[PDB]
């Protein structure tokens, strides 16, 4: 059983914790408690393999990021479809990882959260796919921690990429 070090990254309030806790514990975190740094462990099966996931749920604001990126094998970059700045912020995160890893080829997924808040959508699905396309055909998903849509796939996709 291979260990996979996954890192969930993005600006404050996007649902990094909510996504992680839903995935790991099957619970929806309603209260907004800014994260310092939480780590979770979960055994899953991806393409017939028992995998031990270690998921680092990081702070929206943060010298640690460099280290997270050095150590992480796979990164979920999360924005809220509800908040434009959270989407904007993700360029530097993507560029920082590439810098720190010194390679184009880092397992990575773009995740637009708060999909259940369709009404309050500020960021279009197409803007989302457009950003991912441009990022060397990055994996892309819209997700909901509340509704459970595409929660598991975030982590499974990251594993697949690492196995590649």
């Amino acid at each position: 059983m291979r260990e996979y070090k996954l890192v969930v990254l993005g600006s404050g309030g996007v649902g990094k914790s909510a996504l992680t806790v839903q995935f790991v514990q099957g619970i929806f975190v309603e209260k907004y408690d800014p994260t310092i740094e939480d780590s979770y462990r979960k055994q899953v099966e991806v393409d017939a393999q028992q995998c031990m996931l270690e998921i680092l749920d990081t702070a929206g604001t943060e010298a640690m990021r460099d280290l997270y990126m050095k150590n992480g094998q796979g990164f979920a970059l999360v924005y809220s479809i509800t908040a434009q700045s959270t989407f904007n912020d993700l360029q530097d995160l993507r560029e920082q990882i590439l810098r720190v890893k010194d390679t184009d080829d880092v397992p990575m997924i773009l995740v637009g959260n708060k999909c259940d808040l369709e009404d309050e959508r500020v960021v279009g699905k197409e803007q989302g796919q457009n950003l991912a396309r441009q990022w060397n055909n990055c994996a892309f998903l819209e997700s909901s921690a509340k509704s459970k849509i595409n929660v598991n796939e975030i982590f499974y996709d990251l594993v697949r990429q690492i196995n590649r």
Binding site: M1, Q25, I36, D38, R41, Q43, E62, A63
Partner: protein, 310 residues
């Protein structure tokens, strides 16, 4: 970004970072606040401090970082090891005082998974002594919880190697009675899977697991180390488990259950030098002494958990 923080671990190896508002002066009580738990969740659990050779439950007023600092002195006072040996970490775990009656009330999914993770840890470590059938049930529930629904295709043959068994059966049994169990674990797995009457909600499956653990005599025990002497005079190293049900002695090496005593079926006396305690097995005409520098803690806890019944 300056402020102080600490990792509070759980049994599964996960952790939550908690701001230390008062540096090393921060208390258990305040740290428990820094978690993502309600007044419901929090009542079941507290901060422990643990290294490999010692686990202590701390109390609301304790300053955990001070215990971390003073650990070599603590190890010196309570154990026989060289104190530079090990560094403790802080963990969130079940309060040893938590009445089983109360725990049976619990509905909160997070409290259930935290209790379940800890229970699972004790099972796999061998601290839960139970009939082979009860253990097979626990392995089957673990299979449902961790691997999801039974699949004829995936699960039928040679899937329960030692690899997979290790995650579902006590380590003490992994190569003794466990490989003989596979037919019967899978059977019960399949039975769970294809039972439409048994809920597959995570918290429901985990609560079921706990239900089967509540019956085990050592459930929820704080463990201490010490030694007993038998006939013609050998040292048997032991775990002393004190839980809300009674006192339990485990052979340290094998984890075998030596004695298990319900409260009000035995008496205890602490040593004058606070280094041993005697157990008088009232209405059983038997006795034994346990040597440990933890004797003081054992006796205090025995009193508490005994006094807790009414």
């Amino acid at each position: 970004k300056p402020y102080e923080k600490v990792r509070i671990y759980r049994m599964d190896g996960s952790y939550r970072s908690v701001e230390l508002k008062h540096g090393n002066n921060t208390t258990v009580q305040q740290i428990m606040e820094g978690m993502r738990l309600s007044q419901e969740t929090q009542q079941y659990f507290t901060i422990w401090i643990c290294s490999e050779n010692l686990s202590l439950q701390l109390k609301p007023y304790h300053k955990p970082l001070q215990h971390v600092r003073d650990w070599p002195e603590i190890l010196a006072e309570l154990t026989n090891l060289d104190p530079q040996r090990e560094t403790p970490q802080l963990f969130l775990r079940r309060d040893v005082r938590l009445p089983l009656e109360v725990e049976k009330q619990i509905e909160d999914p997070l409290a259930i998974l935290i209790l379940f993770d800890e229970a699972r840890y004790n099972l796999l470590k061998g601290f839960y002594t139970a009939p082979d059938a009860k253990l097979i049930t626990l392995a089957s529930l673990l299979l449902q919880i961790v691997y999801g629904n039974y699949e004829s295709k995936k699960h039928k043959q040679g899937f329960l190697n030692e690899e997979n068994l290790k995650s579902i059966v006590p380590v003490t049994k992994l190569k003794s009675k466990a490989p003989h169990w596979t037919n019967r674990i899978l059977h019960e797995y399949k039975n769970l899977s294809t039972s439409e009457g048994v809920s597959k909600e995570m918290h429901h499956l985990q609560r079921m697991f706990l239900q089967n653990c509540w019956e085990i005599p050592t459930y929820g025990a704080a463990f201490f180390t010490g030694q007993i002497f038998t006939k013609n005079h050998k040292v048997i190293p032991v775990y002393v488990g004190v839980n809300i049900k009674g006192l339990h002695l485990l052979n340290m090496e094998t984890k075998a259950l030596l004695i298990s005593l319900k409260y009000g079926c035995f008496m205890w006396q602490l040593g004058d030098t606070d280094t041993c305690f005697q157990i008088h097995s009232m209405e059983n005409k038997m006795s034994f002494i346990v040597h440990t520098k933890q004797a003081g803690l054992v006796v205090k806890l025995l009193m508490k958990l005994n006094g807790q019944l009414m």
